[PDB]
Amino acid sequence: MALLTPDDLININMQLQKADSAVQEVTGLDIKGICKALYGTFSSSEKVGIVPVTSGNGIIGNFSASLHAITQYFGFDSFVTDMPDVSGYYEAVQNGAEIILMADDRTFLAHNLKNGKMANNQPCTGIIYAEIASRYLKADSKDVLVVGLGKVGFPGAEHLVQKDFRVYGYDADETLLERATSNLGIIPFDPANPKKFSIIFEATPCANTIPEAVLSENCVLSTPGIPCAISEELRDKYEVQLIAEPLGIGTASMLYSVL
């Protein structure tokens, strides 16, 4: 359970702006374009009701405001209800929400009431970050290092296998590693035997999980993980093309997936 903190979400508009430019640089597409490639969809001011939730750890400072900003950025007609929980859900439906957006400590979801489609943040995030990684314009081959094979990492790796990549997976939990190798057919990556990658997808809640031996100049590191998977020093040394943003890209993936 690695939950966002209010500090992760400070100046979310700038974080999203910067992530969008990096995505354009790496892939030639903006985030909307990535979403169009994945799902074939575009926004048309659909009304999105964002419902604060007091369950578990409770309301996270900046969370709903951040979803508010994220959804406006992508062209949705969004709003945040005054009431939380079930009273908030009611308020949202009654005020004409077409899509509901809400999270407890275990599930962040988007539910499109017009067409019944529903998205879970975890696979949506893994998929979009892996898609971004896969579209690095100047990569020499379909070879990608995946570090972290949990709720985000595994569907990301699955997506890459489906796009005919050689996927090299590592997870510190050896049982997760085994399951993923047998279910997905990924290559089990041994850090003691390192190679350089130009494409890396990382989804862990830990810092400095990408060692120097695995980097090449201008390599792409596409990572929803928090805190950052690579030190500032290694990032500067190898001119890493970092795609890393705390909420928006995954939220976009959810929303465009239910359109």
Ligand SMILES: NC(=O)C1=CN([C@@H]2O[C@H](COP(=O)(O)OP(=O)(O)OC[C@H]3O[C@@H](n4cnc5c(N)ncnc54)[C@H](O)[C@@H]3O)[C@@H](O)[C@H]2O)C=CC1
């Ligand atoms: N930026 C965004 O939009 C989003 C970010 N997240 C964040 O992404 C991260 C991953 O989330 P989940 O996949 O749901 O967590 P999870 O706990 O299901 O998976 C994390 C995996 O990383 C592995 N791991 C930890 N340290 C490692 C290391 N040094 N080397 C290799 N593997 C290691 C763990 O064994 C675990 O399997 C968390 O930080 C979460 O907060 C989650 C959803 C969206």
Ligand SMILES: C[C@@H]1CC=N[C@H]1C(=O)NCCCC[C@H](N)C(=O)O
């Ligand atoms: C969706 C984020 C991305 C990474 N971890 C996930 C997380 O922190 N989930 C918990 C969000 C709880 C929201 C709270 N219930 C509120 O409504 O403010």
Ligand SMILES: [Mg+2]
């Ligand atoms: Mg994101």
Ligand code: NA
């Ligand atoms: Na990380």
